[PDB]
């Protein structure tokens, strides 16, 4: 198994640039990897305080006590024990999918490929992160590993649901990164002038007015509108 750590060009991700510009790896090499994690520096104050307080505890000797206490509490496993457990699981269990699990995996692979197709059609450019049959086998392998760690001879739908969640959190997240313009500007101007600052309009009405309408999501980023009633109501948040 290959666990490879890389770095996008320019060091930082630079989400202003296209997702294909940050990653210099070819599609062929990127297709082998089952899960392609793209982590980012959130620069969130509440998370930064937590990270700082954790790192300081690491430095000021507090780790040698806290980790030992957690391990003896039973919420952790020492390296010498996890290594033996991993060897035992690998030499004892090789789970195979149940038919209900296989139906879920197929119906999810179709959804994933449809989403990739619509993203490619919208962007009119092949996605840098590929989704192929090798990724269906990747989800199969993740499901079987999740079942294996429990020594379950057959992989239920719980493992399929968790494997699907893991794939969505890693490779779909990597592939979903996004950077016409005249239509976006027209939509923003017309809804700013028509829909007042303090009121709300329903989305079916905006559809009648008319697309994918990513302009509404962009405005939601700018905190000028807000979809509240389960997406059925578009409310001008006050900007």
């Amino acid at each position: 198994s290959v666990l490879a750590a890389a770095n996008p060009i320019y060091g930082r991700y630079d989400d202003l640039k296209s997702p294909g510009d940050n990653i210099d790896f070819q599609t062929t090499i990127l297709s082998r990897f089952d899960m392609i994690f793209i982590v980012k520096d959130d620069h969130n104050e509440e998370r930064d305080i937590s990270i700082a307080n954790h790192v300081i505890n690491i430095h000021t000797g507090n780790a040698n006590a806290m980790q030992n206490q957690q391990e003896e509490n039973g919420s952790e496993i020492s390296i010498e024990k996890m290594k033996r457990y991993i060897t035992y699981c690998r030499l004892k269990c090789a789970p195979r999918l149940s038919p209900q699990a296989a139906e879920k995996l197929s119906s999810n692979f179709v959804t994933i490929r449809k989403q990739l197709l619509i993203n490619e059609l919208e962007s009119t450019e092949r996605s840098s992160i590929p989704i192929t049959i090798r990724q269906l086998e990747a989800i199969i392998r993740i499901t079987e590993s999740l079942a294996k760690l429990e020594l379950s001879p057959i992989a239920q739908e719980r493992h399929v649901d968790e494997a699907i969640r893991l794939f969505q959190a890693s490779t779909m997240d990597a592939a979903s990164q996004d950077p016409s313009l005249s239509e976006i500007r027209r939509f923003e101007q017309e809804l700013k002038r028509r829909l007042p600052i303090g009121w709300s309009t329903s989305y079916q009405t905006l559809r009648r007015e008319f697309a994918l309408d990513k302009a509404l999501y962009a405005l939601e980023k700018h905190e000028t509108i807000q979809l509240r009633h389960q997406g059925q109501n578009i409310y001008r948040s006050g900007v």
Binding site: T60, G61, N62, N64, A65, Q69
Partner: protein
């Protein structure tokens, strides 16, 4: 006196008559955990009652609150109670709410009998005169102090008891002064409970090698803080070892022979279970005599090892695998090259027990292993109870360590002892480098506010271990005059401190007239007096009287009032 030395057999026979019924379990033994002497005494009692098939229950109690709660929970069928390691310094009938009229049966005919007998069994000398003299339910296993050194107190107590003009009032105040001067005395220890129970066994005739070994362990538990007591009791153990060892000496070793021996047992730290270098380095006495805490101490140690001609590679080798040339010349080498550094007191005679082919072990090492197992074996008023629960649980680990079939637990205890001594050394060098001990004209305070592994010191035994380290270091410094020391350790989870008022002691091996008079720990009365007024959420429940748990915010005013208190 209540029960002298010569009449322990009377108490044992009374216990047998009252509660040696196979129908039920009418005997309950209350043992104070965090006390090796009480642990060995209770092991002796357990073996003795196993021989006579006397059903009994052994309860480890940590504090006085637990004792009161258990006694309240105690059923009325249980007609024999043993308190091991505590109860001799408090008004037990008052503390437990005991009135003799509700426990008396068959009052008639100059005799009295009671439906429950409480036998207190401890070594702390401030005997409560209402226990040793003015109560029949409470029966104290005296060691001969009361019948010889409490005549004046006996007369003073009885005169006031019987008497309920100017001459009468003056004499009452004179007698009441005798009682008062008897109190306001620090709590010391004169004897070992293990030796007392071994004397009882000698009276009954159940002595054997295992009981003698438990006696040796209990006595050697006192050598660190009460070396005068250990030196007093040592000749008796030396005679007993000679008496019990079989005449078939110099025989070949067989996988069944158990040998108690009196051989040179140097006063190092786990010498046989760790390297020679680590035995010197982590020894309390060597540290005091060389000041290894500073940087120059390690250089002094290396220079000493070079002087003896022991290579550092050989010195750091594990004691089992040390070359037989060096290991067989330790006595000669130590004779030649120890008086130079003032470590002549390192050479000593101790007891070493070998069980067949399992290798030697000395009582000094065994008690360190037992202590380690007691200490680290496994919103605010609840987590503390969880700590008490774990502390009670560790008592059974230390108890099972005594069995010869659980050597795999004694080895774990040895490893824990080495780790705890390492942690104690690290915290000691951290305290002595930052100069945390604030010198005063009353008591040298020292508060642990922050650092590593500070959760080790919420245990009273580990805190006492660190305090003994510091006190040994200070005792060998001539400039530093003798003065009580205070240690505190903040518990972050409960936001409470653990103040442990200690006592100073003279340098080991220094025998003088003032050394003969023991030093008395006056912190108990001071703590109780300060807590009685000025409510400060102080928890005075430990059998070790000079240890309290105080709130984080209330610590400083408490220490201020203690400074204003001239009791100690």
């Amino acid at each position: 006196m209540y029960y002298g030395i010569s009449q322990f057999s009377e108490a044992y026979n009374k216990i047998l008559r009252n509660s040696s019924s196979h129908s039920s379990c009418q005997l309950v033994i209350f043992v104070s955990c965090l006390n090796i002497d009480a642990l060995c005494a209770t092991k002796m009692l357990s073996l003795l009652f196993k021989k006579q098939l006397v059903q009994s229950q052994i309860v480890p109690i940590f504090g006085y609150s637990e004792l009161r709660r258990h006694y309240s929970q105690l059923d009325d069928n249980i007609n024999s109670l043993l308190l091991v390691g505590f109860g001799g310094v408090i008004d037990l009938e008052a503390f437990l709410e005991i009135d003799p009229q509700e426990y008396v049966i068959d009052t008639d005919s100059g005799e009295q009998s009671f439906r429950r007998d409480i036998y207190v069994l401890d070594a702390h000398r401030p005997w409560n005169l209402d226990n040793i003299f003015g109560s029949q339910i409470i029966q104290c296993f005296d060691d001969g102090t009361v019948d010889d050194t409490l005549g004046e107190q006996k007369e003073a107590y009885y005169k006031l008891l019987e008497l309920d003009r100017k001459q009468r009032k003056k004499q009452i105040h004179e007698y009441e002064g005798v009682l008062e001067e008897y109190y306001s005395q620090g709590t010391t220890v004169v004897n070992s409970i293990s030796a007392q129970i071994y004397s009882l066994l000698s009276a009954i005739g159940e002595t054997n090698l295992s009981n003698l070994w438990l006696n040796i362990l209990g006595t050697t538990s006192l050598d660190i803080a009460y070396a005068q007591v250990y030196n007093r009791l040592y000749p008796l153990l030396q005679d007993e070892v000679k008496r019990l060892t079989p005449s078939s000496r110099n025989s070949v070793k067989t996988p069944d022979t158990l040998t108690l021996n009196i051989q040179p047992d140097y006063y190092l730290f786990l010498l046989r279970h760790s390297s020679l270098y680590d035995s010197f380095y982590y020894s309390n006495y060597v540290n005091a005599k060389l000041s290894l805490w500073n940087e120059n101490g390690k250089k002094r140690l290396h220079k000493m090892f070079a002087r003896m001609g022991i290579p550092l590679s050989t010195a750091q080798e594990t004691w089992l695998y040390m070359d037989h040339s060096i290991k067989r010349e330790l006595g000669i080498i130590f004779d030649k090259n120890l008086d130079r550094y003032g470590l002549q007191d390192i050479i000593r005679d101790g007891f070493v027990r070998t069980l067949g082919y399992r290798g030697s072990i000395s009582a000094s090492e065994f008690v360190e292993a037992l202590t380690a197992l007691l200490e680290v074996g496994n919103n605010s008023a609840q987590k503390l109870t969880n700590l008490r629960k774990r502390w009670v649980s560790n008592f059974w680990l230390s108890w099972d360590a005594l069995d010869d079939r659980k050597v795999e637990l004694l080895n774990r205890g040895i490893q824990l002892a080495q780790d705890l001594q390492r942690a104690i050394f690290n915290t000691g060098v951290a305290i002595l480098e930052k100069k945390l001990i604030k010198h005063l004209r009353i008591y040298r305070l020292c508060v642990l506010q922050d650092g590593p592994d500070l959760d080790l010191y919420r245990n009273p035994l580990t805190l006492l271990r660190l305090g003994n380290w510091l006190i040994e270091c200070c005792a060998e410094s001539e400039d530093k005059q003798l003065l009580p020391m205070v240690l505190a350790s903040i518990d972050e989870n409960t936001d409470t401190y653990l103040v442990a008022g200690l006592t100073p002691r003279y340098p080991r091996g220094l025998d003088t007239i003032h050394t003969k008079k023991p030093i008395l720990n006056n912190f108990s009365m001071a703590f109780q007096q300060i807590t009685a007024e000025t409510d400060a959420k102080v928890r005075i429940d430990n059998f070790e009287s000079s240890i309290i748990e105080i709130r984080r915010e209330d610590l400083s005013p408490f220490l201020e009032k203690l400074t204003l208190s001239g009791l100690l």
